[PDB]
């Protein structure tokens, strides 16, 4: 899509703590924040 | 003209001077917040860094003072 200056398209809420839940984030929710969709041609991943 | 070949009796020794890094001291005394971190996600528009240590439950702190900084479980 392409955006216009001054015109925004409203989107519904997920109703889970807002965009960032201040009360906390579980392990399975933070697993998706962990393996966030970075472009893999320019991404290095590492675990120990 | 030159009649004699003479050398000087006083023998000089060249003082060998050299600068080496022999002492290793450093004044480590800062005033800053230091955190226990189970995850840190640094998002600036050029480089994104995601460092995750696993847990059952996390928290979230978010700093937008300089660049987006997301801290999991403080």
Q: Topology of this structure?
A:
This is part of a larger assembly, with chains A (48 residues) and B (74 residues).
Chain A: E1 25-26, H1 27-34
Chain B: E1 39-43, E2 48-52, E3 57-58, E4 60-63, E5 68-72
Antiparallel strand pairs in B: 1-2, 1-5, 4-5
Task: Walk me through this protein's architecture.
- It is classed as ribosome.
- The entry lists the keywords mitochondrial ribosome, assembly intermediate, ribosome.
- Head domain of the mt-SSU assemblosome from Trypanosoma brucei.
- Chain A is mainly alpha-helical and 48 residues long.
- In chain A, 4% of the residues are buried.
- Chain A has one helix and one strand.
- Chain B is mainly β and 74 residues long.
- A four-stranded antiparallel β-sheet of chain B has the order 2-1-5-4, with no helix packed on it.
- In chain B, a hairpin with a 4-residue loop joins strand 1 and strand 2 (48-52).
- Chain B is rod-shaped.
- The termini of chain B are far apart.
- Chains A and B meet through strand 1 and helix 1 of A and strand 2 and strand 3 of B.
- Strand 1 (25-26) of chain A pairs antiparallel with strand 3 of chain B.
- Could you tell me how far the N terminus lies from the C terminus of chain B, measured between alpha carbons in angstroms? 92 Å
The main pleated sheet of chain B reads as: 4 strands, antiparallel
Structure class of chain B: mainly beta
- In total, the number of strands of chain B is 5
PDB class: ribosome
Keywords: mitochondrial ribosome, assembly intermediate, translation, ribosome
Entry title: Head domain of the mt-SSU assemblosome from Trypanosoma brucei
Chain A: mt-SAF17
Provide a compact summary of the structure.
The structure is cut from a larger assembly and holds chains A (48 residues) and B (74 residues). Chain A has 48 residues and is mainly α.
Provide keyphrases for this structure.
2 chains; A: 48 residues; mainly alpha; B: 5 strands; ribosome; mitochondrial ribosome; assembly intermediate
